[PDB]
Amino acid sequence: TIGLIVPDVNNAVFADMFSGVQMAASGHSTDVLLGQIDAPPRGTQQLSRLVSEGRVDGVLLQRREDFDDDMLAAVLEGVPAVTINSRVPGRVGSVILDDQKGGGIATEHLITLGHSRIAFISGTAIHDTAQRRKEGYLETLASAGLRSEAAWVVDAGWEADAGSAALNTLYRGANLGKPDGPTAVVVASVNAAVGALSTALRLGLRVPEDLSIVGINTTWVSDTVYPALTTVRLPLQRLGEVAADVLMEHLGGRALTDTVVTQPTPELLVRETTAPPT
Amino acid sequence: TIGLIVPDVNNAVFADMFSGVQMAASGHSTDVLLGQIDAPPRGTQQLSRLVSEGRVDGVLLQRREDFDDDMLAAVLEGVPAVTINSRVPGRVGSVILDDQKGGGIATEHLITLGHSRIAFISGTAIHDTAQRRKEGYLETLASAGLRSEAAWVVDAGWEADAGSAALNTLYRGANLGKPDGPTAVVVASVNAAVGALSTALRLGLRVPEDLSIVGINTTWVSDTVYPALTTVRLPLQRLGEVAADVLMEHLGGRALTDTVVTQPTPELLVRETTAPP
């Protein structure tokens, strides 16, 4: 049996990631025990108890956006563990997505539509996955001969409320959607993107006319809402299958590895929130 | 270890329910195993093997929307089990929400704003939760003393794509949002309600000006979208908390019960999707 420890089961990547974990694990007649952890302080305790005590042979951990590298390294000391959608410095055993290429594809799509001033709403400063996606965006702008500004890049979060809050901050401080501000924003995760789209609409901005929006990752929500969010689909199911496999293989005696799921490549899903600027 | 068996982790109720089941289990030194089953007989083999091989001590099962009462009985025969957000006649061990009262409260609200032609997009015909909420909406139209038609009640599903399909049908078949049509629609579950909204807007109906939408249950999605969906919040965390408790008390000897979580009461959460017609 294996443990899947997650920040919350409402998280955007959870459903596809879980189905992958479950399919691989069941394939080997191994069950998946699900656990959910709060914010630190209680967050770290639950994890120490829930990891130490262990009715599980090993652990798949999706790191919380408020857990620093320190809080994870200490807990994972001496535990067979694979981090998923995150990699902690100074240990081995992780499976991540091709985050830089995801940020790059999102950004590139906006540059091909004619946008020059493009903002980025990231996850937290703590989350290595957010920083990779930010890098992809930064490289892409640079190679295209374009500039970003400190004011156009906000560390927010994965969820709707942080996305909303960050859009508000761009709107009020950066003239996002106004006269000389950025005309498009890339959002590091799709739920934050749904929050951003909503806030742009409540503020009175036309989407896509006044502001284009691309989210990274895709859910039924991003595909359902009106206008439907243009997104970059990442292979979440594969990510869960590979991480489950790396863990189970390590329990059979193999080395833990640190890998990047690179196939399939990220898929641009052009919906209704991206157009050329005005 | 106990099993939490659900049809789709994307379900509107899953998150809150699960936090409930985890609370209960955490205090009783018990782990939760998350699982799914296919249609019987496959599913019958699955659930029994889960207990027969000692993988779980007991099961909490949310019924799939394409499971009729016969199918659920099959998989549950000879299994320590408590059904969640659903109740099978012919067996004991279930914990349901105050479903009728929640469907009425959504309808109540639409009439109070001044609506007289009110639709209902249900779950599937075979889900008991969906029918119990349909009952509340009908019973409230009769308490107020108002019209209802066969064409205004459409069976659909829990999910966005079902809600959207049902809305299209109300629009083409029942003239929804037009001179003849109903001016409002209660949607049996929130994801379907987000589907209905989206399709309403695409068509070119203004919401709430041309059509008023209320959903039952509440997620970050219904609160986040624009316009935000008016919904009626049921106490999903307690339902999870209480169901897990009944199963584990039953694993220590107690009888399986059939329970309704009647407190807290359905909370009308007014947002941007409801207005006078």
Side-chain angles (χ1 to χ4, degrees), chain A residues 36-41 43-47:
Chain A
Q36 187 170 258
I37 275 58
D38 298 337
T44 190
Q45 213 174 335
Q46 297 148 124
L47 190 51

mmCIF file with all atom_site columns, all heavy atoms in Angstrom, chain A residues 36-47, unseen atoms left out:
data_model
loop_
_atom_site.group_PDB
_atom_site.id
_atom_site.type_symbol
_atom_site.label_atom_id
_atom_site.label_alt_id
_atom_site.label_comp_id
_atom_site.label_asym_id
_atom_site.label_entity_id
_atom_site.label_seq_id
_atom_site.pdbx_PDB_ins_code
_atom_site.Cartn_x
_atom_site.Cartn_y
_atom_site.Cartn_z
_atom_site.occupancy
_atom_site.B_iso_or_equiv
_atom_site.pdbx_formal_charge
_atom_site.auth_seq_id
_atom_site.auth_comp_id
_atom_site.auth_asym_id
_atom_site.auth_atom_id
_atom_site.pdbx_PDB_model_num
ATOM 1  N N   . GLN A 1 36 ? -4.643 14.555 3.547  1.00 0.00 ? 36 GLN A N   1
ATOM 2  C CA  . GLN A 1 36 ? -4.803 15.955 3.247  1.00 0.00 ? 36 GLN A CA  1
ATOM 3  C C   . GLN A 1 36 ? -4.240 16.730 4.407  1.00 0.00 ? 36 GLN A C   1
ATOM 4  O O   . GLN A 1 36 ? -4.669 16.494 5.554  1.00 0.00 ? 36 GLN A O   1
ATOM 5  C CB  . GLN A 1 36 ? -6.288 16.266 3.130  1.00 0.00 ? 36 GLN A CB  1
ATOM 6  C CG  . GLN A 1 36 ? -6.600 17.647 2.671  1.00 0.00 ? 36 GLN A CG  1
ATOM 7  C CD  . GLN A 1 36 ? -8.061 17.803 2.337  1.00 0.00 ? 36 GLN A CD  1
ATOM 8  O OE1 . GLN A 1 36 ? -8.444 17.806 1.165  1.00 0.00 ? 36 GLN A OE1 1
ATOM 9  N NE2 . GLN A 1 36 ? -8.896 17.911 3.366  1.00 0.00 ? 36 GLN A NE2 1
ATOM 10 N N   . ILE A 1 37 ? -3.314 17.661 4.113  1.00 0.00 ? 37 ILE A N   1
ATOM 11 C CA  . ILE A 1 37 ? -2.624 18.478 5.144  1.00 0.00 ? 37 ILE A CA  1
ATOM 12 C C   . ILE A 1 37 ? -2.913 20.006 5.114  1.00 0.00 ? 37 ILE A C   1
ATOM 13 O O   . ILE A 1 37 ? -2.877 20.644 4.048  1.00 0.00 ? 37 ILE A O   1
ATOM 14 C CB  . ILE A 1 37 ? -1.089 18.236 5.082  1.00 0.00 ? 37 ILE A CB  1
ATOM 15 C CG1 . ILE A 1 37 ? -0.736 16.983 5.905  1.00 0.00 ? 37 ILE A CG1 1
ATOM 16 C CG2 . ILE A 1 37 ? -0.343 19.417 5.622  1.00 0.00 ? 37 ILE A CG2 1
ATOM 17 C CD1 . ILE A 1 37 ? -1.461 15.731 5.429  1.00 0.00 ? 37 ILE A CD1 1
ATOM 18 N N   . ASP A 1 38 ? -3.168 20.562 6.306  1.00 0.00 ? 38 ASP A N   1
ATOM 19 C CA  . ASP A 1 38 ? -3.397 22.013 6.511  1.00 0.00 ? 38 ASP A CA  1
ATOM 20 C C   . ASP A 1 38 ? -2.127 22.877 6.414  1.00 0.00 ? 38 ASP A C   1
ATOM 21 O O   . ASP A 1 38 ? -1.039 22.380 6.101  1.00 0.00 ? 38 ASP A O   1
ATOM 22 C CB  . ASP A 1 38 ? -4.067 22.262 7.874  1.00 0.00 ? 38 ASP A CB  1
ATOM 23 C CG  . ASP A 1 38 ? -5.442 21.611 7.987  1.00 0.00 ? 38 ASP A CG  1
ATOM 24 O OD1 . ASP A 1 38 ? -6.056 21.359 6.916  1.00 0.00 ? 38 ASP A OD1 1
ATOM 25 O OD2 . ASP A 1 38 ? -5.901 21.361 9.139  1.00 0.00 ? 38 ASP A OD2 1
ATOM 26 N N   . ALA A 1 39 ? -2.291 24.181 6.671  1.00 0.00 ? 39 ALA A N   1
ATOM 27 C CA  . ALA A 1 39 ? -1.175 25.145 6.690  1.00 0.00 ? 39 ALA A CA  1
ATOM 28 C C   . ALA A 1 39 ? -0.274 24.903 7.908  1.00 0.00 ? 39 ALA A C   1
ATOM 29 O O   . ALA A 1 39 ? -0.745 24.405 8.928  1.00 0.00 ? 39 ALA A O   1
ATOM 30 C CB  . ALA A 1 39 ? -1.719 26.589 6.734  1.00 0.00 ? 39 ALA A CB  1
ATOM 31 N N   . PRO A 1 40 ? 1.021  25.260 7.811  1.00 0.00 ? 40 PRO A N   1
ATOM 32 C CA  . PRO A 1 40 ? 1.850  25.218 9.015  1.00 0.00 ? 40 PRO A CA  1
ATOM 33 C C   . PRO A 1 40 ? 1.340  26.304 9.928  1.00 0.00 ? 40 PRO A C   1
ATOM 34 O O   . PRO A 1 40 ? 0.956  27.370 9.451  1.00 0.00 ? 40 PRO A O   1
ATOM 35 C CB  . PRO A 1 40 ? 3.267  25.541 8.515  1.00 0.00 ? 40 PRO A CB  1
ATOM 36 C CG  . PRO A 1 40 ? 3.138  25.847 7.046  1.00 0.00 ? 40 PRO A CG  1
ATOM 37 C CD  . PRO A 1 40 ? 1.683  25.992 6.720  1.00 0.00 ? 40 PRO A CD  1
ATOM 38 N N   . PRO A 1 41 ? 1.345  26.070 11.241 1.00 0.00 ? 41 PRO A N   1
ATOM 39 C CA  . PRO A 1 41 ? 2.043  25.067 12.053 1.00 0.00 ? 41 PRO A CA  1
ATOM 40 C C   . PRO A 1 41 ? 1.446  23.651 12.052 1.00 0.00 ? 41 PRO A C   1
ATOM 41 O O   . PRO A 1 41 ? 2.207  22.680 11.959 1.00 0.00 ? 41 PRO A O   1
ATOM 42 C CB  . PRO A 1 41 ? 1.951  25.662 13.466 1.00 0.00 ? 41 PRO A CB  1
ATOM 43 C CG  . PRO A 1 41 ? 0.653  26.433 13.462 1.00 0.00 ? 41 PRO A CG  1
ATOM 44 C CD  . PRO A 1 41 ? 0.358  26.836 12.032 1.00 0.00 ? 41 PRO A CD  1
ATOM 45 N N   . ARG A 1 42 ? 0.117  23.537 12.183 1.00 0.00 ? 42 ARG A N   1
ATOM 46 C CA  . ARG A 1 42 ? -0.561 22.233 12.314 1.00 0.00 ? 42 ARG A CA  1
ATOM 47 C C   . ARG A 1 42 ? -0.244 21.353 11.114 1.00 0.00 ? 42 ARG A C   1
ATOM 48 O O   . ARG A 1 42 ? -0.192 20.122 11.227 1.00 0.00 ? 42 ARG A O   1
ATOM 49 C CB  . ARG A 1 42 ? -2.075 22.414 12.442 1.00 0.00 ? 42 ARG A CB  1
ATOM 50 N N   . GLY A 1 43 ? -0.037 21.998 9.964  1.00 0.00 ? 43 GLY A N   1
ATOM 51 C CA  . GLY A 1 43 ? 0.362  21.330 8.738  1.00 0.00 ? 43 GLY A CA  1
ATOM 52 C C   . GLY A 1 43 ? 1.580  20.454 8.870  1.00 0.00 ? 43 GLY A C   1
ATOM 53 O O   . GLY A 1 43 ? 1.599  19.347 8.311  1.00 0.00 ? 43 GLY A O   1
ATOM 54 N N   . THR A 1 44 ? 2.613  20.955 9.567  1.00 0.00 ? 44 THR A N   1
ATOM 55 C CA  . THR A 1 44 ? 3.877  20.209 9.674  1.00 0.00 ? 44 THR A CA  1
ATOM 56 C C   . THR A 1 44 ? 3.726  19.019 10.634 1.00 0.00 ? 44 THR A C   1
ATOM 57 O O   . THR A 1 44 ? 4.173  17.905 10.343 1.00 0.00 ? 44 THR A O   1
ATOM 58 C CB  . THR A 1 44 ? 5.113  21.097 10.029 1.00 0.00 ? 44 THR A CB  1
ATOM 59 O OG1 . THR A 1 44 ? 6.307  20.313 9.873  1.00 0.00 ? 44 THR A OG1 1
ATOM 60 C CG2 . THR A 1 44 ? 5.053  21.661 11.472 1.00 0.00 ? 44 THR A CG2 1
ATOM 61 N N   . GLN A 1 45 ? 3.035  19.254 11.740 1.00 0.00 ? 45 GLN A N   1
ATOM 62 C CA  . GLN A 1 45 ? 2.685  18.201 12.706 1.00 0.00 ? 45 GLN A CA  1
ATOM 63 C C   . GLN A 1 45 ? 1.899  17.044 12.051 1.00 0.00 ? 45 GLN A C   1
ATOM 64 O O   . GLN A 1 45 ? 2.321  15.898 12.132 1.00 0.00 ? 45 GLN A O   1
ATOM 65 C CB  . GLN A 1 45 ? 1.880  18.809 13.862 1.00 0.00 ? 45 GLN A CB  1
ATOM 66 C CG  . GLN A 1 45 ? 2.116  18.146 15.217 1.00 0.00 ? 45 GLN A CG  1
ATOM 67 C CD  . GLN A 1 45 ? 1.417  18.871 16.359 1.00 0.00 ? 45 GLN A CD  1
ATOM 68 O OE1 . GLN A 1 45 ? 1.144  20.067 16.278 1.00 0.00 ? 45 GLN A OE1 1
ATOM 69 N NE2 . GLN A 1 45 ? 1.126  18.142 17.431 1.00 0.00 ? 45 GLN A NE2 1
ATOM 70 N N   . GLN A 1 46 ? 0.777  17.356 11.385 1.00 0.00 ? 46 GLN A N   1
ATOM 71 C CA  . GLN A 1 46 ? -0.022 16.334 10.675 1.00 0.00 ? 46 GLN A CA  1
ATOM 72 C C   . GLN A 1 46 ? 0.868  15.527 9.774  1.00 0.00 ? 46 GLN A C   1
ATOM 73 O O   . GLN A 1 46 ? 0.726  14.309 9.680  1.00 0.00 ? 46 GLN A O   1
ATOM 74 C CB  . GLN A 1 46 ? -1.115 16.932 9.794  1.00 0.00 ? 46 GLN A CB  1
ATOM 75 C CG  . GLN A 1 46 ? -2.224 17.724 10.495 1.00 0.00 ? 46 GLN A CG  1
ATOM 76 C CD  . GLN A 1 46 ? -2.749 18.868 9.611  1.00 0.00 ? 46 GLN A CD  1
ATOM 77 O OE1 . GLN A 1 46 ? -3.942 18.971 9.329  1.00 0.00 ? 46 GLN A OE1 1
ATOM 78 N NE2 . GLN A 1 46 ? -1.846 19.720 9.171  1.00 0.00 ? 46 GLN A NE2 1
ATOM 79 N N   . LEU A 1 47 ? 1.796  16.203 9.106  1.00 0.00 ? 47 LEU A N   1
ATOM 80 C CA  . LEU A 1 47 ? 2.654  15.519 8.147  1.00 0.00 ? 47 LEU A CA  1
ATOM 81 C C   . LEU A 1 47 ? 3.673  14.640 8.862  1.00 0.00 ? 47 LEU A C   1
ATOM 82 O O   . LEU A 1 47 ? 3.881  13.509 8.455  1.00 0.00 ? 47 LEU A O   1
ATOM 83 C CB  . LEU A 1 47 ? 3.326  16.516 7.187  1.00 0.00 ? 47 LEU A CB  1
ATOM 84 C CG  . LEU A 1 47 ? 4.075  15.957 5.975  1.00 0.00 ? 47 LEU A CG  1
ATOM 85 C CD1 . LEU A 1 47 ? 3.221  14.978 5.178  1.00 0.00 ? 47 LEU A CD1 1
ATOM 86 C CD2 . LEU A 1 47 ? 4.569  17.099 5.076  1.00 0.00 ? 47 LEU A CD2 1
#
